[PDB]
Amino acid sequence: GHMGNAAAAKKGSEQESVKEFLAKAKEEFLKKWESPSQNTAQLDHFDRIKTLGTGSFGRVMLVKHKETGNHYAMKILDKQKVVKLKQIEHTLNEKRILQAVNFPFLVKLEFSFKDNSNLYMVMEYVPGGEMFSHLRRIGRFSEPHARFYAAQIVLTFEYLHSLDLIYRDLKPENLLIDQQGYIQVTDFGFAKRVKGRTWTLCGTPEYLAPEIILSKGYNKAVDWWALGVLIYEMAAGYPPFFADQPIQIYEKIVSGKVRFPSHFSSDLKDLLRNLLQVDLTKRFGNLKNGVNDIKNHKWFATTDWIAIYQRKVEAPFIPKFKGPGDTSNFDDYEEEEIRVSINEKCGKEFTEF
């Protein structure tokens, strides 16, 4: 067979140890999920330094905690805007997930609070920037470099899926690089805790699994499809399915055809054909052997999964870092005041925040 006795025994033991880890991790998650923390700071505890990101959600600012001197990323949401955009449930869900999970590649929420006008989530500052920026600048990542990041996503999805969380928001724009060169996953509004199927059309066109596009009920296998898109984009510099308009992207996604750069290794192409598999009965991550089909694939044969988890692998790329509060790996944005109305807005809607 493919493995001799020693290798087969070591792999078997490793897979059993994963099950043991995940069972404990689920116990820990469920305790925090059922008793969430709240109101752990206030706005005047922080100096606001610079805007690091913006979106329909609001903004993320670099802040400095006055008492400790520590820098953090503060996400600021306007309650009335969240209501207008029909994002109440997603916003509450993001905070509840963030305060309950614990994993080395998931960003840590350190404080949360609200005031008359806004909601605030204060997370560890991840100074290395978005993977997106580095990928577009470098052009493409080598297969070892892409593999280092991919392994972290595999472990993170193995953790999330064990908690019955479907992630649904994978893309380079949503992955940050920390000071040691490891990945931080930050966005959880569109994650959903369900054991079976769900039906919402959500995500980003290039990363949507066919079953989402086709308005089917779908499950956690959509995350393994999205991993295939991510690995492809990291290693090629462009995603597997693109076009001028989303409709044409969707036609390519559902077609069952994917083409590869000539520099892709055969091992990489084999992995990608099994992740970018339109037939759910054949997609890696969705079969009887679960995540093991991915972790044991030839493309990952050099990956030491425990060493990645322990953060003992030397990263292939270390972002520039001049000191705490360095913002050079993020873009520049126009600075807007943060206003706090003298009247509470939307109190009922956000009671649980």
Partner: peptide
């Protein structure tokens, strides 16, 4: 080339989710 086609798509910048 495929790279040129990617540039021509206009989708080389940060991509919005469907709801945005």
């Amino acid at each position: 080339t495929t790279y040129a086609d990617f540039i021509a798509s206009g989708r080389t910048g940060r991509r919005n989710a469907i709801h945005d």
